[PDB]
Each structure stands twice: as structure tokens, then as C-alpha cells.
Design a protein around this ligand. Sequence first.
Ligand SMILES: CNC(=O)CN1Cc2ccc(Cl)cc2[C@@]2(CCN(c3cncc4c3CCCC4)C2=O)C1
Ligand SMILES: CNC(=O)CN1Cc2ccc(Cl)cc2[C@@]2(CCN(c3cncc4c3CCCC4)C2=O)C1
Ligand SMILES: [Cl-]
Lengths: 305, 305
Amino acid sequence: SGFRKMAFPSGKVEGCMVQVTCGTTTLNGLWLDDVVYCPRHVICTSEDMLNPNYEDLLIRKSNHNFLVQAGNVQLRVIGHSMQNCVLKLKVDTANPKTPKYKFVRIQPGQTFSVLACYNGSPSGVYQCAMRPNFTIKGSFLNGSCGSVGFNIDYDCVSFCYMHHMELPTGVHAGTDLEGNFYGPFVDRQTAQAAGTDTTITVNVLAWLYAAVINGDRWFLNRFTTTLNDFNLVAMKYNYEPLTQDHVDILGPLSAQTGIAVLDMCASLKELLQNGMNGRTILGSALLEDEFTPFDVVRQCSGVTF
Amino acid sequence: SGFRKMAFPSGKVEGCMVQVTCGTTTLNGLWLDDVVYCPRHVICTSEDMLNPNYEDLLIRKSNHNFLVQAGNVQLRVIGHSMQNCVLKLKVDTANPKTPKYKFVRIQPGQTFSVLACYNGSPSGVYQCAMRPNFTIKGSFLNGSCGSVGFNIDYDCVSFCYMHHMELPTGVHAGTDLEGNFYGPFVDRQTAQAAGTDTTITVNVLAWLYAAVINGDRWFLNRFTTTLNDFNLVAMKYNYEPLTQDHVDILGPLSAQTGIAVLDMCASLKELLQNGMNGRTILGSALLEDEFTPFDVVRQCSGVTF
Ligand SMILES: CNC(=O)CN1Cc2ccc(Cl)cc2[C@@]2(CCN(c3cncc4c3CCCC4)C2=O)C1
Ligand SMILES: CNC(=O)CN1Cc2ccc(Cl)cc2[C@@]2(CCN(c3cncc4c3CCCC4)C2=O)C1
Ligand SMILES: [Cl-]
């Protein structure tokens, strides 16, 4: 029993974290085989950030202008190239701790673990989700850029996020490991803001199924709803539309508990229209949306890595 | 910016997890140097739990009755002894991945990271606190026994918890790494139950200081309180008594924000009386008590917004 926001074991990623320093800027890099991946803004000063021409800033740099430190060992940069908003530093040493890995681009609603780093040294691990507005609600201070997000499937690390910046509301924006931003953000000091966010409906439903699995059943009722009527209600509370794909994905949880997806949608409709009335679900007074259907199944089954 | 329940990077602990098998029982062990530490109930059957005589069950076992597996390698047991509720298995191989470590017994209110494991393989990492009633609100299924709790201040791992059991309310009980239980719990299937739990007051105060540091003051008021009057109010809400030690410990957070401890106590009294009135503090609609003053200082910016 129990239900916690659980992150993946971070060891396979800790062995890839390095410090990258170019000029007066210092941030984190991901060292996989003989390449170190880091945000391209490592080549920028504060004034450059206002309107940077990255290709022009990069051409003026040599390999010895980049200082890469892995623990207390200095790695030698022997090549450099840019791919979208990510700088790729070719180093003379392959990482002996390189795990089996893939670079994957995630969709909004999907969760991942973040290994927060400062000066190439990991400080903490936490779980979060890609919001519908493509921002993440992370915990990052200055020096955290280059921190990565990932998931694990058996022995393989799927790197999905690299930290680049913080928006005015305190939320975070970054890229996949190919340097493509999530959301309409650009890597420069210009007016940028998170769009209006919505609640990840399929994730709230998965967390309601987790509450039922753990013994919390007060919100269940005799009623059902159509998918269209549920979406008409959800749209009014800034909840994401629930699709037939979402109902299919909730199937295993609908089978383990004996509660149909539309049966559970009628419970969420009542919670949206009445609130919790002084009660909690899994120790929370808010409807939680940062656990996917897969996270619920994995935590209520004991999947190992 | 941001504030998350953050766990320590688990890599140093992942390299110590092994599988211990005795007869038909299989659980987790912690391999440090040439010793594997695991719960002594690994030598018990389900019937043995009603009234186990551990000394009598242990004397009938030889070294080769214990199967220790580290990854896909079988370790050889060359000695066994019992220390309180833990079994210590002397193995012929020292763990080459043994980190710098200490065994520390924690007090109620203190937090730690848990690396949940099944069959010697880590599955997830989450943060939690030793409750005032000496239980933890973990997430553990059958096969998780022997999973450990730890802190990693500097490069040293301080092991503080080993998982042994789940109580009727779904909370968890275990020992320090010397085999001494936290709480009046026994590794016997008795009518033991978790005592009435209370809120960790010093931790709620620390989290209110974190909210102020992150730029939020809506909950503050122009009032102050004596320590005794605050405790008379707090105990009516099942909050732990706040001691002068707790006041001293909150000093740095009080200095960084300019808000006196007894003035933050007055905001807490008012929040208990009024609720949040549709507002949240650091993304939560409940008063959070699983962040110590030390965790807030570790995570938050040294500069108040
Ligand atoms: C909040 N941002 C700023 O004050 C200026 N920022 C311009 C800027 C412009 C484009 C890009 Cl791609 C990055 C950046 C910076 C680089 C570092 N960074 C950042 C990242 N994570 C967390 C925190 C920060 C800044 C201090 C608060 C915590 C940014 O957003 C800095
Ligand atoms: C709920 N308790 C039981 O079913 C019987 N349990 C008596 C018992 C009595 C004393 C001791 Cl020290 C151990 C134990 C067991 C050993 C394993 N275990 C356990 C541990 N963590 C999580 C979960 C469990 C059981 C299934 C639910 C998840 C226990 O409590 C077994
Ligand atoms: Cl302590």
C-alpha cells in the first residue's frame, strides 16, 4: 500500500553528468560515449542573450574555449557542432558509464524524472509532467541549465528533456535531446510567457483509479456519462478533452477495479461540480494530474530496473 | 524558482542493493563491504510470524541456506549473525561500489529518501518523513522488505531506515541499520497499530518560510503569539508541540525573510482557523509537513523574492 510521486532510480544518469564552462558561463552537460550535450546558450554572455546569432558566436570559438569537467578530471574537447538549440562537444574520452539509451520526444501529459544538477554534480531527483502548455513545474535555480529529464524501460534510459530556462511565472522550459524546444519558446532574453494551462484529464482519472486500488472509494457513484457529455463539462473547468484513445489507455485500470471509464468520468464530473466537501483523495485536497495511467500501473505492480 | 518534494540521487544506494533468499522467502539486502544487511524475518514462514523464536529458527540454518544475488552474480555467504531485528550475512566478496557511508538513527520529523526495491532491483525513489508516531507513509508492496531510507549530505550516504512491515492503516514500520525498530513495533504479527499521528509543526513553519522565499506572503498577519499560547492552539489541531529547539532551528529562515518565528506561528494559527479560502501555498491546498528547515535551505534560493 501507499501512493507517492515516485521518480526513476537516477544512477544511470548520474554517471553521465559533467560541468561545461565557456567564458564566464558554467552549466551542466550530458556525456554519452565521446559526446557532451549541453544548451547552446553556454556560448552567450548576458548581453548576447538579448539578440544572439548563435552561428556567429560559435564560429569565433575553438575547442580549447570549452572546459569540460567530469568529477575531478578535465576532458579534452576535440570538436564542436550545433544541432538546433543543443551544442555537441566531441571529447577525447568515451564515457565508460554510458548506459543503454535513446533520445525520445515526449507529448504533453507524459511524466518523467528530472535529475537537478549544479556544476556537473547531481543534487536531487524529482518527478514532473510535460504540461499541456509545454512548460514543466520544476524546481531549478541558476546553474541548473543542462539538467535532464528521462524515463527508464528495463535497462534503457530514454532522455526526453534538457533544461534551458525559467519563465516569469516560475515555470520551466527546455528542449528534447535533439535541441527542439517543447512549446513556442526561443533561447534568448525577450518577452516570453506560459500560455493558459489546462488539467490533464486522463491523468486525473488514472489517479482516481489509484485511489480506488488503495481503498479510497467515497467518490464512486451509481451513475455513468457519455464521452461527449463528460467533455462538455470538462471544457468548462479548463480540463483537457478526453479522447477514445484515453479511454482505451485506461482499460487495464478499468479491469483491475471493475469501474468503467465512463463510470469514473461521472465521479470526476461530480467532484468538478461539487468539490471534495472537506475530504481528501490519497492525502490531497486537489485533483492530481501528474501520474499517467502507466505510472499508476507500475507503482501498483512493482516494476524494477 | 519552484518547490518540489525532492529525493537524493539514488545511484550510490543502487550499487548496494542485492536479493536475499532463505527457503521460500525472498527480499532485499544492503551490501556494504563484505556484509549484507537484511530483515531477520527472511528466516520466517507466514505461520512463524505469530510467535517467532528467531534464535531457534536461526540456529537451524547454515551459511549455504542463504542465497545472495548481486545482479546476475551469486555471492557466497561465509558467516551469519543477528543484531536486534537485522540479519548480517558475511559474504566472501566486498562490494566494489561501496560508497562512503554512516548508519544514523533519525528522530521523528526528519526526512529521508527511500529507494523502493523488489528482488534486489530498484524500482523507484521517493522522499518521506519519520512521522511523530514512528511510522512512514511509504509506497511498498510485497517483496519490498529490506528497501532502505537514506540521506546524502556531501558524498557520504547516511543510512537511516530499513523496511520491515506494513501496519493495518497502510503505513510502514521498520528499523535503523542496527536493527532497532522506530516506534513500539515488533517484527511479529501482533495487534500493533499506528498511534494517532500529529502534524510536524516545525516542518509546516519551514515550508511557510519556503513560500515566502519563493515570493508569496498572502497568509501573513500583523499578529504575534507567545510560544505557550501557540502550543495551546496547535495541540487542538493535532499539531506537535513546538519547542525552543524548533524555534532555534528556524533562525536562518527567519533571518533570510525578516519574519520572526513567533510571527510565522501567528500566521500558522490563522491558517488553521480559516483554511486557505480557495488559495494554494507552493501548489498545495493542504499545509505540508514533510520538508524540514534543512530541506528548505538546501532547495530554496539564498535570495528571497
Ligand atoms: C529568470 N530569467 C532571467 O532572469 C534571465 N534569463 C535569461 C535567459 C534567456 C534565455 C535562456 Cl534559454 C535562458 C535564460 C536564463 C539562463 C538561466 N535561466 C534560469 C533557468 N532555470 C532557473 C533559473 C534561471 C534564471 C534565474 C532563476 C532560476 C534562465 O532562464 C536567464
Ligand atoms: C499486511 N500484513 C500482512 O499481510 C502480513 N505481514 C505480517 C508481518 C508482520 C511483521 C513483520 Cl516485521 C512483517 C510482516 C509482513 C512481511 C511483509 N509485509 C509487508 C511489508 N511491506 C509492505 C507490504 C507488506 C505486506 C503486504 C502489503 C504490503 C509485512 O507486513 C507480512
Ligand atoms: Cl534526526
